[PDB]
JSON list of C-alpha atoms in Angstrom, two decimals:
[
{"chain": "A", "resi": 1, "resn": "UNK", "atom": "CA", "xyz": [103.12, 159.78, 68.05]},
{"chain": "A", "resi": 2, "resn": "UNK", "atom": "CA", "xyz": [101.62, 162.08, 65.42]},
{"chain": "A", "resi": 3, "resn": "UNK", "atom": "CA", "xyz": [98.44, 160.44, 64.10]},
{"chain": "A", "resi": 4, "resn": "UNK", "atom": "CA", "xyz": [97.34, 160.58, 60.49]},
{"chain": "A", "resi": 5, "resn": "UNK", "atom": "CA", "xyz": [93.82, 162.07, 60.17]},
{"chain": "A", "resi": 6, "resn": "UNK", "atom": "CA", "xyz": [91.79, 158.93, 59.31]},
{"chain": "A", "resi": 7, "resn": "UNK", "atom": "CA", "xyz": [94.00, 156.68, 61.48]},
{"chain": "A", "resi": 8, "resn": "UNK", "atom": "CA", "xyz": [92.99, 158.84, 64.45]},
{"chain": "A", "resi": 9, "resn": "UNK", "atom": "CA", "xyz": [89.32, 158.93, 63.40]},
{"chain": "A", "resi": 10, "resn": "UNK", "atom": "CA", "xyz": [89.05, 155.14, 63.53]},
{"chain": "A", "resi": 11, "resn": "UNK", "atom": "CA", "xyz": [91.13, 154.99, 66.73]},
{"chain": "A", "resi": 12, "resn": "UNK", "atom": "CA", "xyz": [88.70, 157.37, 68.45]},
{"chain": "A", "resi": 13, "resn": "UNK", "atom": "CA", "xyz": [85.71, 155.43, 67.12]},
{"chain": "A", "resi": 14, "resn": "UNK", "atom": "CA", "xyz": [87.05, 152.13, 68.47]},
{"chain": "A", "resi": 15, "resn": "UNK", "atom": "CA", "xyz": [87.49, 153.88, 71.82]},
{"chain": "A", "resi": 16, "resn": "UNK", "atom": "CA", "xyz": [83.81, 154.83, 71.97]},
{"chain": "A", "resi": 17, "resn": "UNK", "atom": "CA", "xyz": [84.05, 158.54, 71.13]},
{"chain": "A", "resi": 18, "resn": "UNK", "atom": "CA", "xyz": [81.52, 158.73, 68.29]},
{"chain": "A", "resi": 19, "resn": "UNK", "atom": "CA", "xyz": [78.54, 160.54, 69.83]},
{"chain": "A", "resi": 20, "resn": "UNK", "atom": "CA", "xyz": [79.87, 160.31, 73.38]},
{"chain": "A", "resi": 21, "resn": "UNK", "atom": "CA", "xyz": [77.56, 162.65, 75.37]},
{"chain": "A", "resi": 22, "resn": "UNK", "atom": "CA", "xyz": [76.19, 163.84, 72.03]},
{"chain": "A", "resi": 23, "resn": "UNK", "atom": "CA", "xyz": [79.59, 164.78, 70.58]},
{"chain": "A", "resi": 24, "resn": "UNK", "atom": "CA", "xyz": [80.23, 163.58, 67.03]},
{"chain": "A", "resi": 25, "resn": "UNK", "atom": "CA", "xyz": [83.53, 162.04, 65.95]},
{"chain": "A", "resi": 26, "resn": "UNK", "atom": "CA", "xyz": [84.14, 165.05, 63.62]},
{"chain": "A", "resi": 27, "resn": "UNK", "atom": "CA", "xyz": [84.02, 167.40, 66.64]},
{"chain": "A", "resi": 28, "resn": "UNK", "atom": "CA", "xyz": [86.61, 165.36, 68.52]},
{"chain": "A", "resi": 29, "resn": "UNK", "atom": "CA", "xyz": [88.81, 165.38, 65.41]},
{"chain": "A", "resi": 30, "resn": "UNK", "atom": "CA", "xyz": [88.51, 169.15, 65.06]},
{"chain": "A", "resi": 31, "resn": "UNK", "atom": "CA", "xyz": [89.44, 169.46, 68.74]},
{"chain": "A", "resi": 32, "resn": "UNK", "atom": "CA", "xyz": [92.56, 167.21, 68.57]},
{"chain": "A", "resi": 33, "resn": "UNK", "atom": "CA", "xyz": [93.57, 168.87, 65.30]},
{"chain": "A", "resi": 34, "resn": "UNK", "atom": "CA", "xyz": [93.54, 172.40, 66.70]},
{"chain": "A", "resi": 35, "resn": "UNK", "atom": "CA", "xyz": [94.80, 171.47, 70.15]},
{"chain": "A", "resi": 36, "resn": "UNK", "atom": "CA", "xyz": [97.93, 169.49, 69.10]},
{"chain": "A", "resi": 37, "resn": "UNK", "atom": "CA", "xyz": [97.88, 168.75, 65.36]},
{"chain": "A", "resi": 38, "resn": "UNK", "atom": "CA", "xyz": [97.15, 165.14, 66.40]},
{"chain": "A", "resi": 39, "resn": "UNK", "atom": "CA", "xyz": [100.39, 164.96, 68.40]},
{"chain": "A", "resi": 40, "resn": "UNK", "atom": "CA", "xyz": [100.21, 162.85, 71.57]},
{"chain": "A", "resi": 41, "resn": "UNK", "atom": "CA", "xyz": [103.55, 164.27, 72.83]},
{"chain": "A", "resi": 42, "resn": "UNK", "atom": "CA", "xyz": [102.32, 167.88, 72.63]},
{"chain": "A", "resi": 43, "resn": "UNK", "atom": "CA", "xyz": [102.76, 170.02, 75.76]},
{"chain": "A", "resi": 44, "resn": "UNK", "atom": "CA", "xyz": [102.23, 173.71, 76.54]},
{"chain": "A", "resi": 45, "resn": "UNK", "atom": "CA", "xyz": [103.38, 175.37, 79.74]},
{"chain": "A", "resi": 46, "resn": "UNK", "atom": "CA", "xyz": [101.28, 178.28, 80.99]},
{"chain": "A", "resi": 47, "resn": "UNK", "atom": "CA", "xyz": [103.69, 180.57, 82.86]},
{"chain": "A", "resi": 48, "resn": "UNK", "atom": "CA", "xyz": [100.84, 182.73, 84.15]},
{"chain": "A", "resi": 49, "resn": "UNK", "atom": "CA", "xyz": [99.36, 180.06, 86.38]},
{"chain": "A", "resi": 50, "resn": "UNK", "atom": "CA", "xyz": [102.06, 177.34, 86.43]},
{"chain": "A", "resi": 51, "resn": "UNK", "atom": "CA", "xyz": [99.92, 174.64, 84.76]},
{"chain": "A", "resi": 52, "resn": "UNK", "atom": "CA", "xyz": [100.73, 172.54, 81.70]},
{"chain": "A", "resi": 53, "resn": "UNK", "atom": "CA", "xyz": [98.49, 171.18, 78.90]},
{"chain": "A", "resi": 54, "resn": "UNK", "atom": "CA", "xyz": [99.25, 167.54, 78.02]},
{"chain": "A", "resi": 55, "resn": "UNK", "atom": "CA", "xyz": [98.83, 165.36, 74.93]},
{"chain": "A", "resi": 56, "resn": "UNK", "atom": "CA", "xyz": [96.60, 165.16, 71.88]},
{"chain": "A", "resi": 57, "resn": "UNK", "atom": "CA", "xyz": [93.70, 166.99, 73.59]},
{"chain": "A", "resi": 58, "resn": "UNK", "atom": "CA", "xyz": [95.97, 169.37, 75.51]},
{"chain": "A", "resi": 59, "resn": "UNK", "atom": "CA", "xyz": [94.43, 168.53, 78.86]},
{"chain": "A", "resi": 60, "resn": "UNK", "atom": "CA", "xyz": [95.38, 170.89, 81.69]},
{"chain": "A", "resi": 61, "resn": "UNK", "atom": "CA", "xyz": [97.14, 169.90, 84.93]},
{"chain": "A", "resi": 62, "resn": "UNK", "atom": "CA", "xyz": [95.28, 172.43, 87.09]},
{"chain": "A", "resi": 63, "resn": "UNK", "atom": "CA", "xyz": [92.14, 170.27, 87.13]},
{"chain": "A", "resi": 64, "resn": "UNK", "atom": "CA", "xyz": [92.51, 167.00, 85.17]},
{"chain": "A", "resi": 65, "resn": "UNK", "atom": "CA", "xyz": [95.81, 165.21, 85.77]},
{"chain": "A", "resi": 66, "resn": "UNK", "atom": "CA", "xyz": [98.57, 165.22, 88.36]},
{"chain": "A", "resi": 67, "resn": "UNK", "atom": "CA", "xyz": [102.13, 166.34, 87.50]},
{"chain": "A", "resi": 68, "resn": "UNK", "atom": "CA", "xyz": [103.14, 167.17, 91.07]},
{"chain": "A", "resi": 69, "resn": "UNK", "atom": "CA", "xyz": [104.26, 170.69, 90.12]},
{"chain": "A", "resi": 70, "resn": "UNK", "atom": "CA", "xyz": [101.01, 172.62, 89.58]},
{"chain": "A", "resi": 71, "resn": "UNK", "atom": "CA", "xyz": [100.09, 174.73, 92.67]},
{"chain": "A", "resi": 72, "resn": "UNK", "atom": "CA", "xyz": [96.86, 173.62, 94.32]},
{"chain": "A", "resi": 73, "resn": "UNK", "atom": "CA", "xyz": [95.92, 171.52, 91.29]},
{"chain": "A", "resi": 74, "resn": "UNK", "atom": "CA", "xyz": [93.24, 168.83, 91.14]},
{"chain": "A", "resi": 75, "resn": "UNK", "atom": "CA", "xyz": [93.37, 165.46, 89.35]},
{"chain": "A", "resi": 76, "resn": "UNK", "atom": "CA", "xyz": [89.79, 164.76, 88.22]},
{"chain": "A", "resi": 77, "resn": "UNK", "atom": "CA", "xyz": [90.75, 162.04, 85.70]},
{"chain": "A", "resi": 78, "resn": "UNK", "atom": "CA", "xyz": [92.85, 160.41, 88.45]},
{"chain": "A", "resi": 79, "resn": "UNK", "atom": "CA", "xyz": [95.89, 159.95, 86.23]},
{"chain": "A", "resi": 80, "resn": "UNK", "atom": "CA", "xyz": [99.51, 161.01, 86.18]},
{"chain": "A", "resi": 81, "resn": "UNK", "atom": "CA", "xyz": [99.82, 163.63, 83.43]},
{"chain": "A", "resi": 82, "resn": "UNK", "atom": "CA", "xyz": [102.41, 161.19, 82.03]},
{"chain": "A", "resi": 83, "resn": "UNK", "atom": "CA", "xyz": [99.49, 158.97, 80.97]},
{"chain": "A", "resi": 84, "resn": "UNK", "atom": "CA", "xyz": [98.45, 161.74, 78.57]},
{"chain": "A", "resi": 85, "resn": "UNK", "atom": "CA", "xyz": [101.80, 161.51, 76.76]},
{"chain": "A", "resi": 86, "resn": "UNK", "atom": "CA", "xyz": [101.52, 157.88, 75.59]},
{"chain": "A", "resi": 87, "resn": "UNK", "atom": "CA", "xyz": [101.31, 156.87, 71.90]},
{"chain": "A", "resi": 88, "resn": "UNK", "atom": "CA", "xyz": [98.27, 154.83, 72.99]},
{"chain": "A", "resi": 89, "resn": "UNK", "atom": "CA", "xyz": [95.44, 157.30, 73.52]},
{"chain": "A", "resi": 90, "resn": "UNK", "atom": "CA", "xyz": [93.12, 155.11, 75.63]},
{"chain": "A", "resi": 91, "resn": "UNK", "atom": "CA", "xyz": [93.92, 156.95, 78.89]},
{"chain": "A", "resi": 92, "resn": "UNK", "atom": "CA", "xyz": [93.67, 160.36, 77.15]},
{"chain": "A", "resi": 93, "resn": "UNK", "atom": "CA", "xyz": [90.28, 159.38, 75.71]},
{"chain": "A", "resi": 94, "resn": "UNK", "atom": "CA", "xyz": [89.09, 158.27, 79.18]},
{"chain": "A", "resi": 95, "resn": "UNK", "atom": "CA", "xyz": [90.12, 161.63, 80.56]},
{"chain": "A", "resi": 96, "resn": "UNK", "atom": "CA", "xyz": [88.54, 163.57, 77.66]},
{"chain": "A", "resi": 97, "resn": "UNK", "atom": "CA", "xyz": [85.29, 161.70, 78.37]},
{"chain": "A", "resi": 98, "resn": "UNK", "atom": "CA", "xyz": [85.57, 162.77, 82.02]},
{"chain": "A", "resi": 99, "resn": "UNK", "atom": "CA", "xyz": [86.03, 166.43, 81.00]},
{"chain": "A", "resi": 100, "resn": "UNK", "atom": "CA", "xyz": [82.89, 166.48, 78.85]},
{"chain": "A", "resi": 101, "resn": "UNK", "atom": "CA", "xyz": [80.73, 164.83, 81.50]},
{"chain": "A", "resi": 102, "resn": "UNK", "atom": "CA", "xyz": [80.90, 168.24, 83.23]},
{"chain": "A", "resi": 103, "resn": "UNK", "atom": "CA", "xyz": [78.39, 171.10, 82.43]},
{"chain": "A", "resi": 104, "resn": "UNK", "atom": "CA", "xyz": [80.29, 172.67, 79.51]},
{"chain": "A", "resi": 105, "resn": "UNK", "atom": "CA", "xyz": [80.52, 169.45, 77.51]},
{"chain": "A", "resi": 106, "resn": "UNK", "atom": "CA", "xyz": [82.85, 169.88, 74.51]},
{"chain": "A", "resi": 107, "resn": "UNK", "atom": "CA", "xyz": [82.88, 173.64, 75.24]},
{"chain": "A", "resi": 108, "resn": "UNK", "atom": "CA", "xyz": [85.32, 173.01, 78.09]},
{"chain": "A", "resi": 109, "resn": "UNK", "atom": "CA", "xyz": [88.06, 173.58, 75.47]},
{"chain": "A", "resi": 110, "resn": "UNK", "atom": "CA", "xyz": [88.27, 177.20, 74.36]},
{"chain": "A", "resi": 111, "resn": "UNK", "atom": "CA", "xyz": [89.95, 176.15, 71.10]},
{"chain": "A", "resi": 112, "resn": "UNK", "atom": "CA", "xyz": [86.86, 174.05, 70.23]},
{"chain": "A", "resi": 113, "resn": "UNK", "atom": "CA", "xyz": [84.65, 177.15, 70.58]},
{"chain": "A", "resi": 114, "resn": "UNK", "atom": "CA", "xyz": [87.12, 179.18, 68.49]},
{"chain": "A", "resi": 115, "resn": "UNK", "atom": "CA", "xyz": [87.66, 176.77, 65.61]},
{"chain": "A", "resi": 116, "resn": "UNK", "atom": "CA", "xyz": [84.99, 174.04, 65.67]},
{"chain": "A", "resi": 117, "resn": "UNK", "atom": "CA", "xyz": [81.76, 175.47, 67.09]},
{"chain": "A", "resi": 118, "resn": "UNK", "atom": "CA", "xyz": [79.29, 176.39, 64.35]},
{"chain": "A", "resi": 119, "resn": "UNK", "atom": "CA", "xyz": [81.86, 175.37, 61.74]},
{"chain": "A", "resi": 120, "resn": "UNK", "atom": "CA", "xyz": [81.62, 172.83, 58.91]},
{"chain": "A", "resi": 121, "resn": "UNK", "atom": "CA", "xyz": [83.65, 169.97, 60.45]},
{"chain": "A", "resi": 122, "resn": "UNK", "atom": "CA", "xyz": [82.58, 167.27, 57.95]},
{"chain": "A", "resi": 123, "resn": "UNK", "atom": "CA", "xyz": [86.03, 167.46, 56.36]},
{"chain": "A", "resi": 124, "resn": "UNK", "atom": "CA", "xyz": [87.66, 165.93, 59.44]},
{"chain": "A", "resi": 125, "resn": "UNK", "atom": "CA", "xyz": [86.10, 162.50, 58.99]},
{"chain": "A", "resi": 126, "resn": "UNK", "atom": "CA", "xyz": [85.45, 162.30, 55.26]},
{"chain": "A", "resi": 127, "resn": "UNK", "atom": "CA", "xyz": [86.88, 159.21, 53.62]},
{"chain": "A", "resi": 128, "resn": "UNK", "atom": "CA", "xyz": [87.85, 157.65, 56.95]},
{"chain": "A", "resi": 129, "resn": "UNK", "atom": "CA", "xyz": [85.32, 154.82, 56.95]},
{"chain": "A", "resi": 130, "resn": "UNK", "atom": "CA", "xyz": [83.70, 156.02, 60.15]}
]
């Protein structure tokens, strides 16, 4: 499913993402936007290390979910990577929360640092009723 901007904003809010570990809803929107264009079916194989990024937040199989084909991978969110490909983002949101509970917080995603950190992200939630 490819979410519409405000549709996603309210969906994330209902899921408890607004201010989760100090991260605003606009930051999460900027992340999802740059990671997958709000596409839950998005995937990216990394030939260099044999891992794959899954879903709307492009979560990596080396540490967060199990796909059975990533060498010596971990599964910190304790989910099949398949769970990160559902139209319903509840499992993806649970996993994203798990990622940010670690030291780096939202910085765990390099794309967030590149296109959201120290940027004006107000535009991502304006007019969404959040």
